[PDB]
Every structure is written in structure tokens, then in C-alpha cells.
């Protein structure tokens, strides 16, 4: 919901074409009194309470809350035997059929999420295999998120990624309240 | 619109067994978009309901209403249709089983009144439906007699029970 923008919009009685003149005199006609032909009571009139897009649903949870959500999702994967640790993601062959059979042999479920430390240093063997697969997704360590972990049955993390995750997640537990955004220089940050 | 009456002449029954009774021939015919009122056409359709094919033509021929000629023309082409297409031996051996009128598609026109006011008149159209069944017309139901009334009343008195008890 934080990055959702709703583009639905309707025209109110002030934005529908025409309707300036009173359709008929107030009294004497024997009909219901009306002041415009674009009233919401009318066919083809404006919308009383409709969408007024574009509408933004942007909101941010506290940084520690969103950092804690990754810890909970990682713990759930380990507790339910849905987490597997690899020394490296290198494959003997780039054929995607090898990866699918490997997951089936090891009982990794229908969907497997593969996480590597950095996008640039991803092995070419795994990249070719995952590009041709739909239920096997390869993302960098910076791209880990609760939604992707929950959508994919199995989570695969490399040894450098585990160290990367521990450094980033545990940094929130022992950090000062910020004087200014952490993008600005700090004495001991980054690293 | 619906045209289900024209489709009732396309039903092919399975052949009868040698011991089965003869099935009367049923003929469905209708005329669509008749420039006449269904209310006025109903009386003509009601008049010939239950009559034989020949008696219905006689009554319609000497009727001053406009729809009488239209209905008579429908019966004449339905009577020929029975013998020519529906395998009816005698053209006089038919009776009016069903005959009724239905509303058709109508056109709306403006009728001018005084003081700049107006009313909307409709150019009324109607449909006429007729069903012919082979065989002599069924006899009319005899009027209920005093014996039937007395027998029914005694049956009512012999069917009453002690209510609201065991």
C-alpha cells in the first residue's frame, strides 16, 4: 500500500458538461424542482461521492519495525525448514532443467527464492537458469523483502548474504536516534 | 423478440407402436405484426376458440371487425398447411384448440393537444396465434346439474372431521 497510487477519478456535478441553466421554473410546472441537469440525481449527471484520483496511499512504518519484519520472516523460514544455506550459487550447467530437478530432489517446494550478495557478482550459471524460470527468482541481498519471502515457499541464502543480513539487521538494535539522515557522513557508518 | 410458435411445427415424434392409439395432428400457425389492437383481436380469437375449422370460418366471414378477415386468412393458410405438410387426411377434420392475441412491437407518435401540450400515441401492433388439432371438436362441458350439486354437497359433509382434537 505504501507505493500504491489510485488513478480512478470521476467528474462531479461541477465538471460535467453543461447544466448551467435551471431546466424549468421552480413552481407551476407540476414536476419535481431541479436546478441543473447534471445533478447526481439525474441520468448523465455528476458523481456525488466518487473517486477523486490520483490518490496516494503513501505511509512509512518506523525503520526499526520494517527491519524487525525481516528478522521475523527469516526466523519463520528457519523454524519451518524453509531456509537453506549455500556456500555459492554456482551451477555446473546453465540449463534451467537442472535447477528444477535439484529443487524437486531436495524437496524445496513449488517456489524457491534465491538471494545473492551483490547483483554484479552473481554467477552466470545461476543467472541463465533463473532467467528462464518463473517460480525460481534470483534477487540481490539488498532486494530481500517480506513480501517476496512470503510469496516464495523456499528461501535460499548464501553465506556472504547471511553475514550481510546480520550486520544490517542487528545494526538497528544498537544504534542511536538519528540526528540527521544516515546518508550523510557518520563517524562509524557505513561500516 | 420471440418466435417460439413457429418452432412448434418442427417437433418430430418417434414412430408409434402398433397398439398405440392414433395421435391427433397438431398444427401451429401465427401472423406477426398485425396492424390491429390486441385487445380488439382478443374478442375475435375468443369467439372461435373451441369451434371447428369450418364453423370458425363461417363466423369470421360475416363479422364486421377488421381482424375477422385477418384471422380467417390465417385459418385458411393453416388449414391448407395441415393437409399439405402435416399429413391431415380431411381438411374439415380440424378444430381451434388454441387461439389468442399477443402484443407486438409498436411505434410511438406525438399527438398535439391545446395550449401547447401534447400526448404520446402508440401505433399498436399485435400477433395472432392459432393451434389446430386434427379430429372433431371436443363437446362443450354440460352445465352442472342438481344431482351433481347435491352429490358434491353431501361429499363435503362426509369429509369433515372433528378438528382440534385427537
Amino acid at each position: 500500500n505504501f507505493k500504491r497510487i489510485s488513478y480512478a477519478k470521476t467528474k462531479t456535478r461541477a465538471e460535467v458538461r453543461g447544466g448551467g441553466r435551471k431546466p424549468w421554473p421552480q413552481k407551476g410546472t407540476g414536476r419535481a424542482r431541479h436546478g441543473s441537469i447534471r445533478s447526481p440525481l439525474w441520468r448523465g449527471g455528476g458523481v456525488a461521492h466518487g473517486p477523486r484520483g490520483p490518490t496516494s496511499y503513501y505511509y512509512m512504518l518506523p525503520m526499526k519495525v520494517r527491519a524487525l519484519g525481516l528478522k521475523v520472516a527469516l526466523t519463520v523460514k528457519l523454524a519451518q525448514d524453509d531456509l537453506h544455506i549455500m556456500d555459492s550459487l554456482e551451477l555446473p550447467t546453465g540449463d534451467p532443467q537442472y535447477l528444477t530437478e535439484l529443487a524437486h530432489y531436495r524437496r524445496w517446494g513449488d517456489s524457491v527464492l534465491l538471494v545473492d550478495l551483490t547483483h554484479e557478482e552473481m554467477p552466470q550459471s545461476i543467472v541463465e537458469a533463473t532467467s528462464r524460470l518463473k517460480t525460481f527468482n534470483l534477487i540481490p541481498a539488498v532486494g530481500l523483502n517480506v513480501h517476496s519471502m512470503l510469496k516464495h515457499q523456499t528461501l535460499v541464502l548464501t553465506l556472504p548474504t547471511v553475514a550481510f543480513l546480520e550486520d544490517k539487521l542487528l545494526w538497528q538494535d544498537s544504534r542511536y536516534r538519528p540526528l540527521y539522515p544516515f546518508s550523510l557522513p557518520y563517524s562509524d557508518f557505513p561500516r | 423478440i420471440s418466435r417460439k410458435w413457429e418452432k412448434k411445427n418442427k417437433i418430430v415424434y418417434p414412430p408409434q407402436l402398433p397398439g398405440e392409439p392414433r395421435r391427433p395432428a397438431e398444427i401451429y400457425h401465427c401472423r406477426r405484426q398485425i396492424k390491429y389492437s390486441k385487445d380488439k383481436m382478443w374478442y375475435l380469437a375468443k369467439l372461435i376458440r373451441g369451434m371447428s375449422i369450418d364453423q370458425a370460418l363461417a363466423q369470421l366471414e360475416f363479422n364486421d371487425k377488421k381482424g375477422a378477415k385477418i384471422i380467417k386468412e390465417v385459418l385458411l393458410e393453416a388449414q391448407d398447411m395441415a393437409v399439405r405438410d402435416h399429413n391431415v387426411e380431411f381438411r374439415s377434420n380440424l378444430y381451434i384448440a388454441e387461439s389468442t392475441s399477443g402484443r407486438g412491437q409498436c411505434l410511438k407518435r406525438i399527438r398535439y393537444h391545446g395550449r401547447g401540450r401534447f400526448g404520446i400515441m402508440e401505433k399498436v401492433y399485435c400477433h395472432y396465434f392459432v393451434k389446430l388439432v386434427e379430429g372433431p371438436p371436443p363437446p362443450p362441458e354440460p352445465p352442472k346439474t342438481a344431482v351433481a350439486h347435491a352429490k358434491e354437497y353431501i361429499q363435503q359433509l362426509r369429509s369433515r372431521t372433528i378438528v382440534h382434537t385427537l
Binding site: G28, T29 | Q105, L107, K108, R109, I110, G116, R117, F118
Partner: peptide
Amino acid sequence: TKKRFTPPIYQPKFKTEKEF
């Protein structure tokens, strides 16, 4: 009191001109 006259309102002509 003043005269209270309400002019008649003619409906659009197309509503009574449709044909088969």
C-alpha cells in the same frame, strides 16, 4: 396578485419519430 403562467415544455422530437 401577479399572473402565474407556466409555458409548456416541448419534449425532443426524436422520441416520437423512431421507425422499424
